[PDB]
Ligand binder design. Sequence first.
Ligand SMILES: NC(=O)C1=CN([C@@H]2O[C@H](COP(=O)(O)OP(=O)(O)OC[C@H]3O[C@@H](n4cnc5c(N)ncnc54)[C@H](OP(=O)(O)O)[C@@H]3O)[C@@H](O)[C@H]2O)C=CC1
Ligand SMILES: CN(c1cnc2nc(N)nc(N)c2c1)c1cccc2ccccc12
Length: 206
Amino acid sequence: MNQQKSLTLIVALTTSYGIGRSNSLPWKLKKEISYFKRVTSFVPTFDSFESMNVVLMGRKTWESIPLQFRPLKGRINVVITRNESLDLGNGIHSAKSLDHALELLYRTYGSESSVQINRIFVIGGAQLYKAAMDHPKLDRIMATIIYKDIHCDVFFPLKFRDKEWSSVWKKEKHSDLESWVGTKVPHGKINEDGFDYEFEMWTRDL
Ligand SMILES: NC(=O)C1=CN([C@@H]2O[C@H](COP(=O)(O)OP(=O)(O)OC[C@H]3O[C@@H](n4cnc5c(N)ncnc54)[C@H](OP(=O)(O)O)[C@@H]3O)[C@@H](O)[C@H]2O)C=CC1
Ligand SMILES: CN(c1cnc2nc(N)nc(N)c2c1)c1cccc2ccccc12
């Protein structure tokens, strides 16, 4: 009654797999955030009357989001934590592992529910990404590649863009990224703050 939907991981990372520094992002990129909001929120119009997407995140990520921007609007939010007592407020969901989140969601939003789930995203941090990369239902990575070896202290756990992983993970064409994301997405290099970045989509076979 569960293992039926695929998981999609969304991440912005340097060419050295850096994702974080001092409990925050190593960059300030407003349009990169707008893309993250766009992808994580998008539900096809017909299904958008009743269906929403879900963002799964680690408790340090949840705490890293300035309060002004939490919970992430227009998406079902779930925080992964072993702190049974952490009070999320506003009902925000809490779960003790990736699979306990999945069971909670399916229980909460089943055929007996006004709200239905469309897509499920894993949105960080490194610890939850490590669990997600080990999960048998993770098949897609929406990666924002940042072309600067910006100093980081937290790293993405599996080098999916490298030669060692290239029989399993493959980068899809931009049109395929767009057909998946449901809208036209900026193609090629964007420079918001002194370095280039670009949007990619990587998939593997389940
Ligand atoms: N560049 C990007 O795209 C992103 C970067 N980041 C960066 O990641 C860094 C934070 O990453 P990290 O320190 O790894 O933190 P996480 O956000 O992964 O949160 C870790 C905490 O989440 C809970 N948790 C995570 N995974 C599991 C699990 N598999 N099972 C049970 N509990 C789990 C635990 O909570 P508890 O301790 O309460 O039990 C753990 O202490 C920051 O620098 C942040 O800015 C974050 C998201 C995106
Ligand atoms: C968890 N997070 C974040 C930011 N950008 C991301 N970019 C990509 N491509 N992928 C992610 N998982 C992101 C997460 C955030 C970290 C800090 C502030 C945020 C404000 C609004 C939305 C997300 C915020």
